[PDB]
């Protein structure tokens with residue numbers, strides 16, 4: 579997504595590399611469909627069963643990519659919408675996010691997993707959504723931010 | 727797809743219908759893509775062997 | 776409510792799920808009385824949000 583943007587923003591363009599990346603983005607998009615939950619969220623293995631839960635960090639990585647490869651081409655909205663309902667549920671009144679981890683490996687995430695940056699990256703990618711900077715949710719985030 | 731164009735011409739639409747049918751387009755697109763031949767034709771079982 | 780500092784207001788606030796909309800409203804707080812607010816909501820863009 580951010581390579582295509584890097585070429586598109588710098589005017590380093592060409593069409594059939596977009597057809598290339600179209601095969602790419604479609605197969606990957608539905609690959610993520612291979613491991614979500616019908617509540618909406620995303621963990622390592624997922625589909626065909628309910629014996630698992632999603633992931634703050636990874637589903638944030640997911641939804642940032644949603645928003646930007648949405649920001650070039652067609653998307654459908656209800657899915658990522660219910661993903662937002664999930665993320666909305668999962669944080670305290672006055673405290674931070676929970677790394678409800680069902681991850682894969684140790685250094686996939688280049689961040690060292692502080693609760694600090696856990697909760698921050700969640701909320702601020704959630705802001706990197708086409709969404710407000712006003713919602714009570716992210717205010718609870720900002721409370722955690724001042725805390726952090 | 728055929729009723730999609732049908733709707734688009736008959737003029738009676740409810741657009742989130744088509745957003746989730748856009749879901750249908752790309753998901754059938756790719757879950758059919760994962761079963762083709764290497765050449766371009768198609769078989770029934772195929773992929774991974 | 777009850778107990779120590781009814782200098783309080785409970786609330787059933789409302790911030791929706793996509794874009795921006797809200798139904799902010801306030802509700803009193805006196806001790807150990809079940810005074811039940813009757814708030815309300817109007818329609819939306821989409822049917823079942």
Ligand SMILES: *[C@@H]1O[C@H](CO)[C@@H](O[C@@H]2O[C@H](CO)[C@@H](O[C@@H]3O[C@H](CO)[C@@H](O)[C@H](O)[C@@H]3O)[C@H](O)[C@H]2NC(C)=O)[C@H](O)[C@H]1NC(C)=O
Nearest residue numbers: 582583585586587590591592593595596599649650651652
């Ligand atoms: C490269 O960047 C652009 C953003 O600048 C990506 O979005 C495409 O931008 C063009 C305009 O440059 C859009 O065309 C416009 O569409 C609207 C209706 O949506 C119409 O009202 C305007 O008159 C104009 O025709 C285009 O829709 C939009 N996406 C595409 C091409 O479908 C573009 O996707 C990026 N291309 C890549 C991936 O390199």
Ligand SMILES: *[C@@H]1O[C@H](CO)[C@@H](O)[C@H](O)[C@H]1NC(C)=O
Nearest residue numbers: 710711712794795796797798
């Ligand atoms: C939400 O915030 C946006 C900011 O531009 C504003 O335009 C819009 O009217 C607001 N919607 C409501 C009704 O809260």
